[model samples]
Target: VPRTIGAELMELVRRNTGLSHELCRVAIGIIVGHIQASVPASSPVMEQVLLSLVVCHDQQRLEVIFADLARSWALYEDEGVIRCYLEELLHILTDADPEVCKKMCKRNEFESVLALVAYYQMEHRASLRLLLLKCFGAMCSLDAAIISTLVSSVLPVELARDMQTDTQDHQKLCYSALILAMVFSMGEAVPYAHYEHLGTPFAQFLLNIVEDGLPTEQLPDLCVNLLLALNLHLPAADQNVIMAALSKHANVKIFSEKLLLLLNRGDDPVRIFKHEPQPPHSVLKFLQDVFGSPATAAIFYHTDMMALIDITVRHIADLSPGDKLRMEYLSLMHAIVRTTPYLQHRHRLPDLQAILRRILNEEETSPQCQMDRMIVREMCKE
Candidate 1:
């Protein structure tokens, strides 16, 4: 089959039967079409065709092919074409099944998906909306504009009306989506322009979640977990968006303080600590994954230390006085500092000292506060 004729034949098949099978095999046709049409050999047309094939065909087969194609595309083809193809495929997969997208993250299939989502948003408007929400829900490291789009789209009067009397499953889904959207929308990288677009209505929505709602403990846990997940994945530059968003909602500031008080109480009931020894495997693995090895100060000390600073400050600002939450917080701090000693960089030492000082200076020190201060002092000795 000549190339030009083959491209037409595949298009005909797609149009006639809506069958996307054998579409990948028709790459020769597309390559032929590109050549016959005198399009640049490096053009993304064929790559696009192949990408379309991956998502449009059977998911299992597409996964196998994509695994091979992602490995080889750079060697034989223009990197740009491969990039476009990968982005399109990610869009398809994300739209079709978000759980599949989550599975991809666990499998380290994130790079291709992230690149594709980032690029697609730059080119397409509707894609900008969908991709931003999916990125917020799945990738967490997305920029502020993506987050802003999620905030704006989710609480449109239309969706709010649907959510008002939704079924339990529907409410859970809606709430999960809302929390993910808010986390992404208000993060550091979101522009003032985008923030301006979200002002009053967004503020009201957050207020409703924190205050007026039925006091389900699960809701607060949901909110905090979303924040933790965002902390894990969101880039530093984009965290400003979250700060800005929080600043806009006074009620959130108040609730956040109360939440921290609860956290400070820790999960332990006793004022006195008990010994519980466990392997440091998870902490060490997380550090290695996040900071690479302990040997490189530049990567390990600066990035992770700053992230800890921001997180600690956020925690302090959200303080609630309770032994259990406070104990948990103390344990978490000790575990991090003990396990990741490259955290001993002089640059981070001042912040550590300041945090300790704040704990000590508090007039009515909860047992959790005492424990946290002790942990910080121990880290200083290291």
Candidate 2:
């Protein structure tokens, strides 16, 4: 039977605090306990309770609960629990108020948060760590300094240490390290144009691991993530280096198959939501379903295309000399223009031109001249 305490707490939560900051902490603890209890008896009740909470609670409250639950799953070493928790958290975090989600990053409640992360590294826990990395990302998006601190702590000690206990130990380390590498490289879901500038030495370190032939099970994710990082730079030469790395480390067969599947979906409208006039809250619910399907790759690929464009255009001025930003921007633009054919689609032409204008107007001379020359070439080709 469901405990009366649970019901009483739920009532108090709704009546007294009504999804305010104080109620969130109370509700999360209850949700965690219900989820942890695996008995069939509790499942139906818990589901009903969660349903009510989701329906009644504010969007910001959902973000708080899911963020807390994600951390709990990570610390407890429960993959099944973590999986559901992450699915929910990502759903909320995607479109929830960035400012509200960022606030959750400040509440580092787990006294042993770092210790728990280290334990996952020490124990070879893959699913737990992956979910935690998502949590790390949620927190990072709100505050870059949080990411920097977390990365500095993890890489300097845990990642560098040699844990020769067994092959399993090494495999676990690889998973943890791969996630860390991606986290350190990413500014957020928005993607940045100068990731190398943010962590040059660490990026090189991750690349070195790939060059050294780390285990293949997690290499593909790490490779794609690294490419995503490299794609931030716009220069062709730097992009070439990343492409070469992709050729070097990527399983050609798997890459080809994934590419084929994505290509098959090429004609579909890019499924990105607009950020203006407030991000759509329902977008999160749709994203949750998308991530759970066979079409996951398609969803991610389209999202990446959108992110690539936004970062290139918005951060063009921030790119430093010798940075790979320009080449990467054009290469991605060329690829998208060829495959997606935005210009052929009148609706997309304005957005594409806006991106071009954003970059072109950033400088007065040779750089803009060079950018104009490239834009002209692309325009002529179509």
Candidate 3:
């Protein structure tokens, strides 16, 4: 699937770790893609990207993909005019060098192109709009200046209005939430941080969508990814606002609901090779990062923990030994054990204790082999 071998540190990256090598390659390519426009691919950025890839743990590749970009190209892949434009714009941003990406944006022509090419055409199609937001989000990550620059421009008008739409464009909204963080998280010294409504007002807006549901389908996972990405800056106590919203609008039931829904999809036919990584794998890794942290784990409760464990347990049992997703689920299960000791906080949730014991019992039975499956499974027991 991914290109590999004798390929510099790139080959090592091509070889290392488990889960979606395609996704890993996509991140590298995006970073490499960004570099090719201005500088040679061999910059300090290469050193840093390779270094991060080496230590960063392969699963984090999805984070880099989100936090890298996507095969969700399926969204706009068919729209020719938009696709060509989106392709070209995204091509420029594919660089990993922060300053290369930054300098690329510095061009007045680049700025003008974004204005006409990005904003005016964004509304014509739902997924077409998705690509531009993806484009802006990718741009925002390259430098805070892009964020500041976007904040300075009229683009936020499109970003703001999309959040309020009736059909509720899910991917666009998540990217909007992320772009909101990239720019507004800048704080009051920047004019647009104040210009941005996302702090309290938009968090409340996120809460509003949470209430009805994103219709509570894919919303749960994305809310965790972008929602927590947005909220993680504040203390956990303040972050509990979304917890109440989760309880009322959609039951916390949907937390694992969407998770396994995608887990079930892991066996589905693969679509495009170059598109964003599939669900469950992407979902699992983010879930690992989500549940691994004390802050986001605070979102879990007795039923939430039990439900997450129960589904994955059954799903794990369903997954054959050689199946790659088994390891992904085990890795998540492994993470759940150490990451969520706070379950002890709310009295006994022993129903949780009982199932967790079962996983540990299973983990204890494993013999180490093949990359991180055993490593993670053994660590699960650990």
Candidate 4:
């Protein structure tokens, strides 16, 4: 009995451990074309074939496969097949030499690849949508140009809306947010129009996720990335969207209290100062940024200002007078005093004056004390 050609080719590619680059290249070329024309779109055969081809480590061969696979994306009618091809291509590109991936992305077919991913994102197939987003994320990571193009397109907006509707499936929501996070993480490369499209909806989506409650399992880094992207990179206008979402929560007071709790929850001054001084955690940084701006500070003032000021003052009292931790706490208090209209509240004014007096009277030459004096002077200027 004669063995079939497809089976024979699969076996050869799979078993050719010591095959010459030339032989491997020819075999991969033939197999990729054959798979494109004849292989079932949903079948894993393409993945297996591509895996074997990658082992050959021939740049030209890989490029040929990439180009053909990109073109094949348009030919296949099945979403699964398209997904498989895109996923395999993503995996190959990720593992390939950076130069090789860069060359592949520079080609016209790569744009076609992105078009296919964007097309599937609108599909009802959750898994397929997620796989395509993952492919987009991987491609964007490889090339900033890809990220810029993606930002200007409808892709980010589509993903943000999908995340908003797909609340029940935690995995889908997570994947959707992950893609948006990747796009927003591009920083200045992202166009202002893209931020306008993505920022508010994404902010609302994240707030919905938080309001719904985190998963029973520990939250993943993807969620943190999403939050940081919203907090750090979003424009002031977009930042207001996040603030609006925060206010819409059912327990806005509780939310603010918890944030304040986390802000002051770290080790005592002795333990914290024993180690090197490091930047605040993301949550703390986020709160500081929110309150740092006068616009946002006004919105959060009633919710967090008094509590924050009280917490900082207590922490300062506990610290050694004029120590680094005490000064750091005082600096944060100064920010609150400067940005927030805490003095208008009147009750906190005496507390603020008392803390400033203590700092001024503490005769010390530490850099923190000098900064503390300047902060006191600034506070007095008001």
**TM-score list, all predictions:** 0.28, 0.34, 0.39, 0.58
- Rank the models by TM-score, top first: 4, 3, 2, 1
What tens-digit string does per-residue lDDT give for candidate 2 at 240-272? 433343334443334333333333332211122
Flag the better candidate by TM-score, 2 or 3.
3
RMSD of each: 19.3, 15.5, 15.2, 13.1
Give the poorly placed runs of model 2, Cα more than 4 Å off. Answer: 1-145, 151-241, 244-253, 260-374, 377-382
| Residue pairs with clashing backbones, model 4 | 41-81
lDDT for every model? 0.42, 0.44, 0.50, 0.59
Error of 2 at 321 (Å): 30
The lowest-lDDT stretch of 10 consecutive residues in candidate 3 is 269-278
Error of 2 at 16 (Å): 9.4
What is candidate 3's lDDT per residue for 72-186, written digit by digit as tens? 3333545776566665556545533334456545666454325533443345576666677677767765655555566566665556555665335666666666655444343
Candidate 4 lDDT at 67 equals 54
At residue 65, give the lDDT of candidate 4. Answer: 46
Better of 2 and 3 by lDDT: 3
Best lDDT among the predictions, by candidate number: 4
